[PDB]
């Protein structure tokens, strides 16, 4: 499980990176087939709010309902 002292330790070219590797695989158990683009617009969010939507269930269903409206027509 990731941690903010875990992401603020790693270099940062690679703290989007760790936190998309993570968020992917939760994010296509909803959509698998708008995973990519899912996953892509909301490591754009602030990785601290990102961290809290790993470790809330409920806050990163929201992220993604959300992130559903940008890509619908
Ligand atoms: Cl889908």
Do not use: C, W, Y
Not at 30 to 39: E, V
Not at 54 to 72: F, G, N, Y
Request: charged share 20%; hydrophobic share 45%.
């Amino acid at each position: 499980p990731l941690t903010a002292s875990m992401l603020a330790s790693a270099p940062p070219q690679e703290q989007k990176q760790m936190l998309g590797e993570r968020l992917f695989p939760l994010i296509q158990a909803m959509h698998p087939t708008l995973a990519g683009k899912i996953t892509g617009m909301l490591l754009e969010i602030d990785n601290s709010e990102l961290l809290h939507m790993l470790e809330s269930p409920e806050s990163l269903r929201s992220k993604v309902d959300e992130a559903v409206a940008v890509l619908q027509a």
